[PDB]
C-alpha cells in the first residue's frame, strides 16, 4: 500500500509508486527512507513541507 504526501507549501502530491523521475525516485521509495536530503520538484524546500494525505 504505497502512501502519498502532499506539499502543503504548494499542493503537490507524492506517489510512493512514482516519485521523481529526474532525481531517481525508483518506483517503490517510501517517504520514510527519504530524509530531508530530498526536496520538492516544484518548490525546493525540505521535507517538512510534505505531509501525509489521509490515513495519518
* 7 binding Cd ion? (CB under 5 A): yes
Nearest residue to 7 via CA among 40, 38, 37: 40
* 51 binding Cd ion? (CB under 5 A): no
Residues 6+ apart with CB under 8 A from 51: 5, 6, 7, 8
Of 3, 9, 34, 39, the one binding Cd ion by CB under 5 A: 9
C-alpha R_g of the chain:
10
Of 8, 43, 51, 52, the one binding Cd ion by CB under 5 A: 43
Is 43 marked within a binding site?
yes
Tell me the binding residues.
7, 10, 40, 43
Tell me the binding residues for Fe cation.
7, 10, 40, 43
Amino acid at each position: 500500500a504505497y502512501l502519498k504526501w502532499i506539499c502543503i507549501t504548494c499542493g503537490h502530491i507524492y506517489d510512493e509508486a512514482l516519485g521523481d523521475e529526474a532525481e531517481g525516485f525508483t518506483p517503490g521509495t517510501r517517504f520514510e527512507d527519504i530524509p530531508d536530503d530530498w526536496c520538492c520538484p516544484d518548490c525546493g524546500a525540505t521535507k517538512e513541507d510534505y505531509v501525509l494525505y489521509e490515513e495519518k
